[PDB]
Amino acid sequence: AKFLKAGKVAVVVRGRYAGKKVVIVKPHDEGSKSHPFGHALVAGIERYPLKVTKKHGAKKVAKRTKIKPFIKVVNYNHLLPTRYTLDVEAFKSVVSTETFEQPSQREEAKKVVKKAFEERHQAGKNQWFFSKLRF
């Protein structure tokens, strides 16, 4: 089948967020007026949450667990696809073609995506996603 989907996790290869894991929300199949190529809307995380342990408590744990999200449009060539998957319904209506451009609507999108990804991480599920890829 066509494997790039709304579930799909991937590693971004080029441009600033290189070696940072993202999840695809809206795959455009072929092209538009801007972005004349096969491109996906994605929603990754820029700064990964640091390690955390039995020793730390309360305030030190809140500082350690904090995540910066990002959102971007990206080419299919620059995305390396991955067998893992993540459920995307918390930020379906947020991220979209209308949402990109017209700033600072981008900032209001990231606040919802922050509240998704941290809250996904508390009671941790998809453990591979929130670990940093080391290279």
Binding site: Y84, T85, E119, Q122, K125, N126
Partner: peptide, 19 residues
Amino acid sequence: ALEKYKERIRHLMETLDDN
């Protein structure tokens, strides 16, 4: 606030499921 915040997380552990 934090104790009410925790039960949301412990709810979201059991309910949400999936990979």
